[PDB]
């Protein structure tokens, strides 16, 4: 049936509790400590936000740097600890990316929304129950639900942005345009 | 709404394409090579199946051995490679467990169904959209969908068994009873 192919709401709740709720809270404070390590002649903007890439094809390439060689790994925050299910502790580190634009170095966190890779696989699969699968519809439920979850948590609301785009430009260019849009409003506030 | 809390079908499709489709196919052949390493006086049964623990609470403890100290790590298959999304290769290894019962050593693969940990978190969370969340209903959609996916792939159908149980006995005892049930029928066939 089509109902077993209602998958997007699940992918969102899983991505949040299994990952985003763990790696995002605290991010501003971590970037404040990390930012103090930049000491250069170069103008640099450090944005304490994770930019989540949601390509329309749902194809998540395995390396950011390989998809856009303008986005280069700048380093990594110090490790921190986060808890699932009350008491299940794991160590994490945020990976900082850097791209140059308009003679200024921009630093942020960037990742693909890896759960949508299953949307890609379900749409190209051969498996049996998949005839009435609608990739864009599930990608929309994912985005919509995930956006609502992220907004409902003040530890994630302002430190996370979902970037939906047609991957058929470049991702660094997309991120630069979003950073400009976001930074204007944070100054307005 | 309740519809954004229809999550079980998603957790199942994600667990399959993001994990089970990758670590299960080939398992019989891997256990055949691994089995040849057992050389002892002890009677031993090597079952080439992954037994997936689905506790009713949806609490997945972080160690099999810590939940049941009768299930001990016996070793690991040689590494193999599996592909997501056509071309995204990662290395994997199957972890073999051993428990003793009735004076015979039983060897198999055992894992908790980790996606259900998000069902646990959604039911104890405080987050906003979660008022009409029904943990058992979502755990049933998960099991039902996952069972259908696993059966539709001949590379997984016979090398995977879902063990649903009330975690309020022991898991090794549960697995032993399922192995007896399964081994009878494989002989009938
Ligand atoms: N980059 C990264 N992502 C993680 C990690 N652990 C969980 N995730 C994400 O959350 C889902 C797990 O819950 O379902 P999957 O596609 O595998 O989706 C996974 C994955 O996208 C991690 O350690 N690193
Ligand atoms: N044991 C193990 N499980 C994996 C691994 N990668 C993915 N999984 C599983 O599949 C989901 C990822 O797709 O959503 P999550 O809860 O994180 O669920 C994850 C996780 O249960 C792995 O490397 N090891």
Automatic annotation (TrEMBL), chains A, B:
Positions of the STING ligand-binding domain: 6-180
Protein name from the UniProt record: STING ligand-binding domain-containing protein
Superkingdom of origin: Eukaryota
GO terms classed as biological process: activation of innate immune response; autophagosome assembly; innate immune response; positive regulation of macroautophagy; positive regulation of type I interferon production; reticulophagy
Transmembrane regions listed in the UniProt entry: none
One Gene Ontology cellular component annotation held by this UniProt entry: endoplasmic reticulum membrane
Molecular function GO terms recorded: 2',3'-cyclic GMP-AMP binding; cyclic-di-GMP binding
Organism field: Magallana gigas
């Amino acid at each position: 049936e089509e109902q077993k192919l209602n998958v997007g709401h699940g992918l969102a709740w899983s991505y949040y509790f299994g990952y985003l709720r763990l790696i995002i809270p605290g991010l501003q404070s971590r970037m404040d400590s990390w930012k103090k390590g930049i000491d250069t002649a170069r103008k640099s903007v450090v944005v304490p936000k994770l930019y989540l890439l949601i390509p329309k094809s749902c194809y998540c390439p395995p390396s950011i740097t390989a998809a856009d060689p303008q986005i280069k790994v700048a380093g990594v925050t110090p490790s921190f600890v986060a808890n699932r299910a009350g008491n299940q502790r794991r160590e994490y580190k945020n990976t900082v990316y850097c791209f140059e634009a308009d003679k200024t170095d921009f630093y942020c966190l960037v990742e693909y929304a890896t759960p949508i890779l299953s949307l890609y696989e379900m749409s190209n699969s051969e498996e049996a129950g998949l005839s009435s699968f609608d990739r864009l519809r599930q990608m929309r439920t994912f985005v919509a639900t995930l956006q609502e979850i992220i907004n409902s948590n003040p530890e994630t609301k302002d430190n996370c942005s979902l970037l939906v785009y047609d991957d058929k430009q470049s991702i660094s260019m997309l991120i630069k345009d979003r950073i400009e849009k976001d930074l204007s409003d944070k100054a307005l506030q």
